[model samples]
Target: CPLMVKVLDAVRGSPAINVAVHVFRKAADDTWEPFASGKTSESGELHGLTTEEEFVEGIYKVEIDTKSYWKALGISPFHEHAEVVFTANDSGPRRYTIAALLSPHSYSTTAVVTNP
Candidate 1:
């Protein structure tokens, strides 16, 4: 079905291993601030993000808070987190539905802009 398209497409896109989504844009001082935050599953899948109210279309940076996630399991992980930078092509007043499917060691994500 068309509705399941994102899930199907999710397999094609992969986020960094053990990464969480930490959105960042240029702050007033031309530096980056922790804008929005999200996490990847144990399998490294990060799809949806609880975006801030002012997420707009432009060049933004994303990061994964991996260290914290693993700390919850009492696992002494090596890396802190993985980071990614992406551009928001469409940031209209629409509900962006993002999904990520993951396993215990890996993950993938799919994002789409929609009215819902």
Candidate 2:
């Protein structure tokens, strides 16, 4: 089996970028359902399947808590929020990884763990 993507996102990392990740699963019928919630690590990245996260086939979404993160940094945010959606073709039977690079104002993007 091949690895799969579980959605991804990139948000600006400022004086200190902090964010919340809301992951969801997509059903065969194209309906979405929440899967897991995670916080960015010290590096301001949220990836991988946490113990609480169980792999399920479907569409995935990443919602960055921009407002709260900015407030935590003691700054005002122009973005009310940000979200990225992706699909995982081979959801199980494969190891997967997800990552992102963020700056204070912009970001370069790649989707999936193995995708560029």
Candidate 3:
């Protein structure tokens, strides 16, 4: 897979299991078109969000349903979701990882890239 994502709950010290993840690809008209959606794995990991052919060079946006995740724990969060937007394209396929960390008061997202 060209892209992978993971989420961790900093408050609970466990994986953000079952957190909803939604993906969108930027269209030529500068609108975000829904592309893929899935819930995190038992280990807070998500795979197969898109295939190599489907993940062509373009700008993409990803957002996770952080509100529900925190709500389930009986907590009110500051941010409803963590969003990441970036342009990805290159001479060859690259592996990208999105690491999302969350707490009741704050949320953050980071990215890692590798040549695969």
Among the numbered candidates, top TM-score falls to 3
Give the runs in model 3 whose Cα sits over 4 Å from its true position: none
TM-score of each: 0.46, 0.60, 0.95
Top lDDT: which candidate number? 3
lDDT of 1 at 70: 52
* Cα shift from native, residue 1, model 3 (Å): 1.0
lDDT of 3: 0.89
Q: What is the lDDT of residue 112 in candidate 1?
A: 59
lDDT of 2 by residue, 6-108 (tens): 2222343232234576766776687777777767665555555343246645566756565566567556656655567766645443344444443334433
What lDDT score goes with residue 10 in model 2?
36
Model 1, TM vs. native? 0.46
Cα lDDT tens digits for candidate 1, 62-95: 5445556556645545555444455553545455
RMSD of 2: 5.5
Query: What clash pairs does model 3 have?
Result: none
Candidate achieving higher lDDT, 1 or 2: 2
Error of 2 at 55 (Å): 1.5
